[PDB]
Enzyme design. Structure first.
Site, short mmCIF file in Angstrom:
data_model
loop_
_atom_site.label_atom_id
_atom_site.label_comp_id
_atom_site.label_asym_id
_atom_site.label_seq_id
_atom_site.Cartn_x
_atom_site.Cartn_y
_atom_site.Cartn_z
N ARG A 6 0.88 -1.19 0.00
CA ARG A 6 0.00 0.00 0.00
C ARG A 6 0.90 1.21 0.00
NH1 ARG A 6 -2.66 4.13 -0.07
NH2 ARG A 6 -4.78 4.39 0.71
N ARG B 65 -0.30 -5.34 4.82
CA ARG B 65 0.29 -4.66 3.66
C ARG B 65 1.52 -3.87 3.99
NH1 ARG B 65 -4.95 -1.46 1.39
NH2 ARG B 65 -4.44 -0.46 3.40
N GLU C 41 -11.28 3.80 -5.36
CA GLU C 41 -11.46 2.37 -5.62
C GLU C 41 -11.84 2.18 -7.10
OE1 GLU C 41 -10.75 0.19 -3.15
OE2 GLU C 41 -10.30 1.94 -1.83
C1 THP Z 1 -2.01 4.28 3.65
C2 THP Z 1 -2.26 3.64 5.00
C3 THP Z 1 -3.45 2.99 5.29
N1 THP Z 1 -3.64 2.41 6.51
C4 THP Z 1 -4.96 1.84 6.87
C5 THP Z 1 -5.92 2.94 7.37
C6 THP Z 1 -7.23 2.58 6.77
O1 THP Z 1 -7.96 1.75 7.71
P1 THP Z 1 -9.48 1.27 7.39
O2 THP Z 1 -9.45 0.07 6.45
O3 THP Z 1 -9.84 0.90 8.81
O4 THP Z 1 -10.22 2.44 6.81
C7 THP Z 1 -6.86 1.79 5.52
C8 THP Z 1 -7.03 2.56 4.23
O5 THP Z 1 -6.45 1.85 3.09
P2 THP Z 1 -7.25 1.78 1.69
O6 THP Z 1 -7.38 3.18 1.16
O7 THP Z 1 -6.35 0.85 0.92
O8 THP Z 1 -8.63 1.23 2.04
O9 THP Z 1 -5.54 1.36 5.68
C9 THP Z 1 -2.67 2.54 7.51
O10 THP Z 1 -2.92 2.04 8.64
N2 THP Z 1 -1.50 3.09 7.28
C10 THP Z 1 -1.25 3.70 6.08
O11 THP Z 1 -0.19 4.33 5.94
CA CA Z 2 -7.90 3.57 -1.94
#
Ligand code: THP
Ligand code: CA
Length: 129
Positions: free
Chosen positions: A29, A75, A37
């Site tokens: 990620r 991730r 999305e």
């Molecule tokens: C980019 C990033 C996302 N995340 C988590 C927060 C969000 O939690 P939630 O799933 O609880 O909303 C999610 C968002 O990623 P996506 O945009 O891939 O869904 O990933 C982190 O914890 N650290 C990060 O640096």
């Molecule tokens: Ca996204």
């Protein structure tokens, strides 16, 4: 920070990709960005953009920041470079991602990305149109 090697396994979407890192398959990620999305407006364009950028690269690198290297879903959290060009930044610069998810201690490239976002907004690109 420093860059480390990885190889593409598979495109996923605008802000996630499957890479091999230290010889293991991981989903990464992209730090400090949020793409739509696939089902959302500019999702398919963001996905295509990130797919092309990784597929055309001779060399993919990952760069971890100073904090957390994996999120709660397992991730990898990184800046991703395709032949030296940061994918995270390019997404933002093209209006295909917003600066987002800026957590203290993993925000080394924040200001770089914010500058990009400002230029994308000025040009009214994509998400900013
Ligand atoms: C980019 C990033 C996302 N995340 C988590 C927060 C969000 O939690 P939630 O799933 O609880 O909303 C999610 C968002 O990623 P996506 O945009 O891939 O869904 O990933 C982190 O914890 N650290 C990060 O640096
Ligand atoms: Ca996204």
């Amino acid at each position: 920070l420093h860059k480390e090697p990885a190889t593409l396994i598979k495109a996923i979407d605008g802000d996630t990709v499957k890479l091999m890192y230290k010889g293991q398959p991981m989903t990464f990620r992209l730090l400090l960005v949020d793409t739509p999305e696939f089902n959302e407006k500019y999702g398919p364009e963001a996905s295509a953009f990130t797919k092309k950028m990784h597929e055309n690269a001779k060399k993919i690198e990952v760069e971890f920041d100073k904090g957390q290297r994996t999120d709660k879903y397992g991730r990898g959290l990184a800046y991703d470079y395709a032949d030296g060009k940061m994918v995270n930044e390019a997404l933002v610069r093209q209006g295909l991602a917003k600066v987002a998810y800026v957590y203290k201690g993993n925000n080394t490239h924040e200001q770089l990305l914010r500058k990009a976002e400002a230029q994308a907004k000025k040009e009214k690109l994509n998400i900013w149109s």
